[PDB]
Design a protein around this ligand. Structure first.
Ligand SMILES: [Fe+2]
Ligand SMILES: [Fe+2]
Ligand SMILES: [Fe+2]
Ligand SMILES: [Fe+2]
Lengths: 169, 169
């Protein structure tokens, strides 16, 4: 059953990939809103987390290619726009939490299909999702508990995420 | 699983093909010996059957390609040389019989893999193997019952299998 094992892993890898593509767009939308509001540090860290999901999306596609499949290019679920700051961190924490639940199941399938390399990929990525979760939880906890005295400190901070995107041009 | 289905059919097609490649060499070895003994009619029909086996190998190969596989180039088992005339026909009948039994199982697998085209290819080739089996049993029977009287009639007969092989030069 070589082919069935391959096919079954590719299916969860494409499920996870589509979840990554949704998070990229969702986090970046919130990044545009945070920058607009001039809350630099929140905006910078939101983009940096979106870049992590980009890297997750890339790794899932590379493994899908190694297994003979085709990486999906459609995002899972819909992006929510116009979210308020308190809503941003509460939904993002919920979404990371849900992501770690789904990936843990995906991990299950990989082990069931005797795929150690893909299982380890999900294991590695779950640890990074956990860092995202803690991040969004903490911010959400400060927002709830301290409100505007917390935000006054973020106002006007730098939004820079480092040297610009090394690209082609 | 589409790919799994194909993989299992390709497996039995390469098993059958390896069996054909064995038969080509076994039968041609006997053709060379019958030609050497100057039993022309026997040598001629041995080669014509070897050529039927070449066409079977070719048809298995082409179906293997349509399925995206690679046709094997190794024969199954070893060629037996130095067989006496009665042994040639006794063993060729046993091999043809063994082949029909195997192909009949291979045909079953194709149906299990929902592969109608490959199953029909097996059914067609099995009927030809039945023609071969019947031929070898008939000759074996004349040799057993008629001895050197039958051979005396075959000595000095034409060995020609027709016009030369349309080839490149
Ligand atoms: Fe991710
Ligand atoms: Fe994440
Ligand atoms: Fe054959
Ligand atoms: Fe045959």
């Amino acid at each position: 059953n070589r082919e069935d094992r391959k096919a079954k892993v590719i299916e969860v890898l494409n499920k996870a990939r589509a979840m990554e593509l949704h998070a990229i767009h969702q986090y970046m939308n919130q990044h545009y809103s945070l920058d607009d509001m001039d809350y630099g540090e929140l905006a910078a860290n939101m983009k940096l987390i979106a870049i992590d999901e980009m890297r997750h999306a890339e790794n899932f596609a590379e493994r899908i290619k190694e297994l003979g499949g085709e990486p999906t290019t459609q995002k899972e679920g819909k992006v929510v726009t116009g979210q308020a700051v308190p809503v941003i961190y509460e939904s993002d924490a919920d979404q990371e939490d849900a992501t770690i639940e789904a990936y843990s199941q995906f991990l299950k399938v990989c082990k069931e299909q005797g795929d150690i390399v893909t299982a380890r990929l999900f294991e590695r990525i779950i640890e990074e999702e956990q860092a995202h979760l803690t991040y969004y939880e903490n911010i959400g906890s400060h927002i709830k508990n301290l409100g505007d005295t917390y935000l006054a400190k973020i106002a006007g901070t730098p939004s820079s995420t480092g040297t610009a995107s090394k690209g082609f041009v």
